[PDB]
Amino acid sequence: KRRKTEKPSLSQLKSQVPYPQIIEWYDCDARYPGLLASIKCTKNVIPVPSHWQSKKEYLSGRSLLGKRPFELPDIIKKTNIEQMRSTLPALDLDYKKLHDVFFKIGANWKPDHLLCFGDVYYENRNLFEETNWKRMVDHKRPGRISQELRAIMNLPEGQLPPWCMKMKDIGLPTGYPDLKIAGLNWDITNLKGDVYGKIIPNHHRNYFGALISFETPEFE
């Protein structure tokens, strides 16, 4: 009773904290709030996954209904057993082939997503969309437009995007000062296919561990 009503306000607790935004309303009933704020707000600690205080047993997810059953890592998919055995609604293969897939072909191979120091998987999360996202931030760059989005845009080949004219009056993108586009800052004769422009960088090892040779263990 008295101890329950003795609690300091969470904002009174914020001042003790160097990173006050992590502390939350429920920290008021922390039996040792001044300590718990220091631990929770300590540098490298990773806050408890928030699926607690929910009674849903951490997975009720509607998204769980729409998750793909599985996908082979493409290196293993090269092994062709996908066609040999149909998992969807004998199969002998070469020892050298399989062994080389894991070792010769797949030594340097690593899953593309993984996760980071403090990455924690909440129920509603799905990594796959973020994998295509990270891969997409990689492939796609300004000045280039795929033929699909080009067809939807109804832009014929050899013709500049509609924002090149408004970009002539307004100016180059503030975010891309080094961006070049045919007809304006960049040679129109170099206009080719899906690329109407490219960023021209103005910036222009061994890491003590350079192996200088790569030799995998041989099965034979």
Partner 1 sequence: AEKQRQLKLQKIYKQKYIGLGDESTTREQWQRNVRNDTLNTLQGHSASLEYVSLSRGDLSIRDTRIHLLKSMSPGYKAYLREE
Partner 2 sequence: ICSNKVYNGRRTFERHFNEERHIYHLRCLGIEPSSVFKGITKIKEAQELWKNMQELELEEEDEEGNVMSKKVYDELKKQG
Partner 3 sequence: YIYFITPLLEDALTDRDLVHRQTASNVITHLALNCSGTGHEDAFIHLMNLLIPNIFETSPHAIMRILEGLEALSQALGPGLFMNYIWAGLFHPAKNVRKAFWRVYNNMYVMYQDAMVPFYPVTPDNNEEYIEELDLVL
The footprint of partner 3 (CB under 8 A) covers 26-27, 29-32, 35-36, 38-40, 42-49, 51-53, 57-59, 61, 64, 67-71, 73, 75-76, 102, 106, 109-111, 113-117, 119-123, 127
Q: Which is nearer to partner 1, 41 or 184 (CB)?
A: 41
DSSP the chain: -TTTT-PPPHHHHHTT-SSTTS--GGGGG-SSHHHHHHHHTSTT--PPPTTTT--STT---SGGGG--S----HHHHTT-HHHHS---------HHHHHHIIIIITSS---S----TT----TT--HHHHHHHHHHHHH--TTB--HHHHHHHTPPTT---THHHHHHHH-S-TT-TTEEEBTTTB-GGG-BTTBSEEE--S---GGGT--S---PPP--
- Whole-number minimum distance, CB 163 to partner 2, in Å? 32
Site string for partner 1, 34-63 (x = CB under 8 A): -x----------------------------
The residues in 6-45 that bind partner 2, with binding defined as CB under 8 A, are 9-12, 14-15, 20-21, 23-25
Task: Assess 31 for contact with partner 1 (CB under 8 A).
Answer: yes
For partner 1, which residue of 4, 25, 26, 32 counts as binding (CB under 8 A)? 32
Give me the torsion for CA of 165, 167, 170, 171, rounded to 10°. Answer: -130
Q: Which is nearer to partner 3, 102 or 186 (CB)?
A: 102
- Whole-number minimum distance, CB 50 to partner 1, in Å? 21
- Whole-number minimum distance, CB 188 to partner 2, in Å? 46
Identify what 192 binds: partner 1, partner 2, partner 3, none; CB under 5 to 8 Å per kind.
none
Identify what 47 binds: partner 1, partner 2, partner 3, none; CB under 5 to 8 Å per kind.
partner 3
